[PDB]
Amino acid sequence: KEPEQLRKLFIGGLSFETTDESLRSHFEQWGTLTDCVVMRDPNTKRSRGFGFVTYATVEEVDAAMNARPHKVDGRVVEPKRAHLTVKKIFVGGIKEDTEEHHLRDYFEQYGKIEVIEIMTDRGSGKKRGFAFVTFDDHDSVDKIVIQKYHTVNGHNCEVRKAL
Numbered sequence: 001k002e003p004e005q006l007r008k009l010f011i012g013g014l015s016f017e018t019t020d021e022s023l024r025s026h027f028e029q030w031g032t033l034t035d036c037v038v039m040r041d042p043n044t045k046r047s048r049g050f051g052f053v054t055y056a057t058v059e060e061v062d063a064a065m066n067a068r069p070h071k072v073d074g075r076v077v078e079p080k081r082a083h084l085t086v087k088k089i090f091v092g093g094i095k096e097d098t099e100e101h102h103l104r105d106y107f108e109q110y111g112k113i114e115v116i117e118i119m120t121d122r123g124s125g126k127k128r129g130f131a132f133v134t135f136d137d138h139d140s141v142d143k144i145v146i147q148k149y150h151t152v153n154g155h156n157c158e159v160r161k162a163l
């Protein structure tokens with residue numbers, strides 16, 4: 001079984017009327033939930049406006065994120081994986097022979113790409129061996145940076161969030 005941390009979604013922006021039960025009934029549409037909790041004040045029991053759900057598998061987390069936007073008890077909520085929320089990555093280690101279609105063909109399966117920038121030397125024009133990829137949504141980046149490995153154009157790449 002995949003590590004539990006990788007099967008969790010934090011859910012922000014909840015209606016204060018959302019309960020453990022109503023959050024569960026909503027998100028069980030996309031997989032088996034092993035946990036589902038609304039965070040509440042310890043004294044008033046008033047909702048803190050966020051909670052988390054834990055799916056049985058990572059593919060179920062993906063299904064839930066692919067079904068955004070989620071309207072839960074009348075309010076559009078904000079699900080995020082286990083936050084520095086950005087849409088852009090640095091990709092290093094691609095050397096000189098890696099081209100845009102290499103990066104596109106690989107990264108398009110994580111999310112919709114809006115910008116690919118292969119970095120070149122300001123003086124010579126030679127490729128510097130790294131690039132930036134911008135997606136239309138942060139979950140692409142979140143899926144990417146939790147992978148242990150990225151292989152693009154036969155190169156073992158270093159990938160990190162870019163600010």
Ligand SMILES: O=C(Nc1nncs1)c1ccccc1F
Binds near residue numbers: 104117
């Ligand atoms: O910015 C991109 N490529 C180029 N950048 N300079 C010339 S063409 C790009 C954007 C979205 C999807 C695929 C892409 F390649």
